[PDB]
Design a protein around this ligand. Structure first.
Ligand code: MH0
Ligand code: MH0
Length: 106
């Protein structure tokens, strides 16, 4: 319905992915790297929601995104996030990327 919105969502999601990768390498990350990830993620969530304003694929994406976001908020309370936590995060995050891309096919 909005191509510009779709692409904005896309570009932001790519930046979320790049930062998370960077962070995945490092054993502790500056509060500045962490916060860019988080603020980027908030804009992905917001643009996606704006897009709602296959239905079953959208529903699965949205549900998945929600769980990744909530997972991430737990991680914000931690100075240090174990690779155990970081694994559940990446796993789930991969599913969000996949389903959103599966939508591109159309
Ligand atoms: C429920 C609203 C919603 C939320 C929340 C949401 C959250 C997220 N998304 Fe994402 N996403 C939403 C709705 C969409 C739609 C509707 C589409 C397909 C747009 C279209 O016009 O076909 C989409 N997302 C598409 C995508 C695509 C593919 C875009 C492309 O290559 O053109 C990616 C990578 C993506 N998402 C990632 C993410 C990530 C990461 C999050 C984590 C916050
Ligand atoms: C596998 C790479 C990777 C990807 C992709 C990724 C994608 C996403 N993320 Fe997110 N994320 C990744 C790796 C991390 C790490 C490693 C950390 C913890 C940083 C640290 O130093 O403890 C993290 N993400 C941390 C977070 C945090 C908390 C920020 C903080 O602790 O300061 C949030 C809110 C978050 N994520 C959300 C999201 C969302 C939403 C997506 C989109 C699905």
């Amino acid at each position: 319905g909005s191509p510009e919105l779709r692409e904005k969502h896309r570009a932001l999601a790519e930046q979320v992915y790049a930062d998370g990768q960077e962070m995945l390498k490092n054993t502790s990350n500056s509060p500045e790297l962490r916060e860019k990830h988080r603020a980027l993620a908030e804009q992905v969530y917001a643009t996606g929601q704006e897009m709602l304003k296959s239905p079953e694929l959208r529903e699965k994406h949205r549900a998945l995104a929600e769980q990744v976001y909530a997972t991430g908020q737990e991680m914000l309370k931690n100075t240090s996030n174990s690779p155990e936590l970081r694994e559940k995060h990446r796993a789930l995050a991969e599913q969000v990327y996949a389903t959103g891309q599966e939508m591109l096919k159309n």
